[PDB]
Design a protein around this ligand. Sequence first.
Ligand SMILES: NC(=O)c1ccc[n+]([C@@H]2O[C@H](COP(=O)([O-])OP(=O)(O)OC[C@H]3O[C@@H](n4cnc5c(N)ncnc54)[C@H](O)[C@@H]3O)[C@@H](O)[C@H]2O)c1
Ligand SMILES: NC(=O)c1ccc[n+]([C@@H]2O[C@H](COP(=O)([O-])OP(=O)(O)OC[C@H]3O[C@@H](n4cnc5c(N)ncnc54)[C@H](O)[C@@H]3O)[C@@H](O)[C@H]2O)c1
Ligand SMILES: O=c1ccn([C@@H]2O[C@H](COP(=O)(O)OP(=O)(O)O[C@H]3O[C@H](CO)[C@@H](O)[C@H](O)[C@H]3O)[C@@H](O)[C@H]2O)c(=O)[nH]1
Ligand SMILES: O=c1ccn([C@@H]2O[C@H](COP(=O)(O)OP(=O)(O)O[C@H]3O[C@H](CO)[C@@H](O)[C@H](O)[C@H]3O)[C@@H](O)[C@H]2O)c(=O)[nH]1
Ligand code: NA
Ligand code: NA
Ligand code: NA
Ligand code: NA
Lengths: 338, 338
Amino acid sequence: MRVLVTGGSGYIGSHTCVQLLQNGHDVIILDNLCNSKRSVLPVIERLGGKHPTFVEGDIRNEALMTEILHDHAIDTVIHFAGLKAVGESVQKPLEYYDNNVNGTLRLISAMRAANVKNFIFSSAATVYGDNPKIPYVESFPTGTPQSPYGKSKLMVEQILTDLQKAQPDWSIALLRYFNPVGAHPSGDMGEDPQGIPNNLMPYIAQVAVGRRDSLAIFGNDYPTEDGTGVRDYIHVMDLADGHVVAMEKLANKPGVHIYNLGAGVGNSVLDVVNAFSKACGKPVNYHFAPRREGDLPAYWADASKADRELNWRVTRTLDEMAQDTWHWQSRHPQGYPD
Amino acid sequence: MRVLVTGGSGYIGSHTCVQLLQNGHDVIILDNLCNSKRSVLPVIERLGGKHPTFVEGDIRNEALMTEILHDHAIDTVIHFAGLKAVGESVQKPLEYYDNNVNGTLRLISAMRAANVKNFIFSSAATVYGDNPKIPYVESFPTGTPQSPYGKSKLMVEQILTDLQKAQPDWSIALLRYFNPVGAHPSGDMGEDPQGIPNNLMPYIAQVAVGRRDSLAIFGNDYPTEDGTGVRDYIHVMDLADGHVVAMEKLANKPGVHIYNLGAGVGNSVLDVVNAFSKACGKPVNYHFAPRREGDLPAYWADASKADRELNWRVTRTLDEMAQDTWHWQSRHPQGYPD
Ligand SMILES: NC(=O)c1ccc[n+]([C@@H]2O[C@H](COP(=O)([O-])OP(=O)(O)OC[C@H]3O[C@@H](n4cnc5c(N)ncnc54)[C@H](O)[C@@H]3O)[C@@H](O)[C@H]2O)c1
Ligand SMILES: NC(=O)c1ccc[n+]([C@@H]2O[C@H](COP(=O)([O-])OP(=O)(O)OC[C@H]3O[C@@H](n4cnc5c(N)ncnc54)[C@H](O)[C@@H]3O)[C@@H](O)[C@H]2O)c1
Ligand SMILES: O=c1ccn([C@@H]2O[C@H](COP(=O)(O)OP(=O)(O)O[C@H]3O[C@H](CO)[C@@H](O)[C@H](O)[C@H]3O)[C@@H](O)[C@H]2O)c(=O)[nH]1
Ligand SMILES: O=c1ccn([C@@H]2O[C@H](COP(=O)(O)OP(=O)(O)O[C@H]3O[C@H](CO)[C@@H](O)[C@H](O)[C@H]3O)[C@@H](O)[C@H]2O)c(=O)[nH]1
Ligand code: NA
Ligand code: NA
Ligand code: NA
Ligand code: NA
């Protein structure tokens, strides 16, 4: 299929692109490189075994989007582009609403103009808000995210749903990601945060690689087995694969298809650390810190739906998530070159 | 004060402008005339007793907005501009989200750029969603609007609140309107809907003026005293005055000031019809029709807060609302000239 991958040079996007190319699709990547580098492109081609077209641009530029869609005879769009640093979002709400809400709106409007009606959205478990019922199931009503980031993802879900209602031929997937971690098995691609990583895994990796002293564990007093926060960590490759399938299976299937994408199991902070210590063959240094504002104590996905309906499920383990990250981290300590 | 009035040529905006000019403020109107006509401008000047500056433009044009704000040394902004036909919103969600959500975002961003931090937003009772507790009080948590229109107003409230948090010097008023009706006492200004009016009053007026046959009463089986829908009708002049006060009193008072703007009392469909029959000296023809999708049975505002805090309250009656509308309707059957 002909697929436009916004944010295709980013973490999850890059990996998805490799997988798409492996399944022989024609990929066109659209990224503004605000959080990624051109240096990944070659890697994606190599690992993908096929050349993906790259366009440097902004999802907010509706005329460009339209031209692209047209020019490339796109069939389906996978939208990963956006801002995602939760903390920052709180400090800088406007940027989030613009990039995420306005960003998506401009894109789907361009789609409409170009007669493109197959869409995949990168959503997040945050939309469930403070749900005491765990694991989280898709049929649960949404809640209220506590950051401009979370709110922006929920808003986009809402707009997309409304769009589909008004334009019923549209096929729209709302993929609610859980906690993506891991890296390509090759260790030649992976997450490349700039500055202080906000997520647990990369932070651990940075401690491990010797860049940072100790991992701060945000809270040791939660109502969990070990008192640390619990989440559903999913391997970026499994995520990648799920997008490929979603894309292939849902194209031209009218509706709003909502699926949780996770392992369907919870792992605590220590579990992850332990997993990483094991992978890197040394104890990861850590310490206990106060709870982090806005963090829930524990949650994980109920991923039955994607299984049943898309025959999709995670195949990588936590170990692999840790190992693959360590490999990348260790093979490319400076990330992607400038 | 120097005040930018978006959507200043529209129904509520026009009346507010007259009042502002009467209190000696410098008014600059920004409207794209998608739902209003230049023909009102002269009327606003006349009735206002002072000349307001008019700029034809779009709130979505952030560079223009910034220039204006700068050029005119604006102190405060009153934002009435937007799309508001509920029904249409359902059919055309994108236009609503763009004009209302993106429209407001572009404006407040321009504000930020121009160092303008006093803002007044036209919100709506719809944000309360399906609240069984009536009347509605500001401290009630918001609900889920059932149209793209309602949703767009709630979203903007949310973004504005987040903005204020991040930019705490901002003074932001969320004025939740109830059911605005009425017209300038002069009968030379009023609501000028194009096509079929969606609101009760104008529709009644059109039946009365002989343009339409009968008023369709949407539902006669509600759990109300007379079985018809109940709402809080407020006179456009009272609304106008409330904006003037809000503006004068809240400027430079940091925070998110939320106020319901209504009469604080409920009136049924028949009550309104009866009021109008009386005003026009003839029976208004009507008939019972099925419930209208999305309509709640009854609600009205709890307007104590604006009273207490702004010393503001409605002074016009339902009779006057009806009379003033009839006068305008009857003196200007073709509305504002082309
Ligand atoms: N990584 C996670 O933990 C997490 C969990 C759930 C949801 N998501 C969502 O998945 C998507 C991808 O996540 P990621 O980890 O790969 O992030 P990433 O930062 O590595 O990828 C985002 C990419 O989008 C690009 N981009 C940003 N704004 C853009 C704009 N306006 N126009 C064009 N390009 C733009 C960035 O340059 C980057 O290449 C995002 O929408 C993110 O919100 C991620
Ligand atoms: N009238 C009501 O019953 C109702 C109740 C509550 C809330 N509101 C809100 O109050 C505000 C004013 O209501 P109204 O009855 O005066 O409506 P109106 O249509 O008469 O006024 C809206 C004005 O905004 C202008 N406009 C629309 N989109 C614009 C854009 N993108 N840029 C520039 N100008 C634009 C229109 O040309 C018009 O002059 C609206 O935001 C409406 O949602 C109204
Ligand atoms: O240095 C760190 C980083 C994280 N944690 C803990 O590790 C867990 C996971 O935290 P993190 O990697 O930051 O994940 P999340 O806060 O769960 O958020 C991610 O996953 C969500 C979906 O579940 C998405 O909404 C977000 O975009 C994404 O960043 C939590 O219990 C954190 O408290 C620490 O203790 N120390
Ligand atoms: O031809 C008509 C029009 C209306 N009604 C009834 O009259 C009442 C008021 O209806 P309408 O004038 O359309 O008002 P609302 O539906 O209450 O909505 C208005 O007031 C809301 C705030 O309370 C705002 O959210 C909206 O922007 C605004 O249009 C309702 O019970 C309607 O069912 C009829 O029976 N027939
Ligand atoms: Na801040
Ligand atoms: Na680097
Ligand atoms: Na429709
Ligand atoms: Na006319």
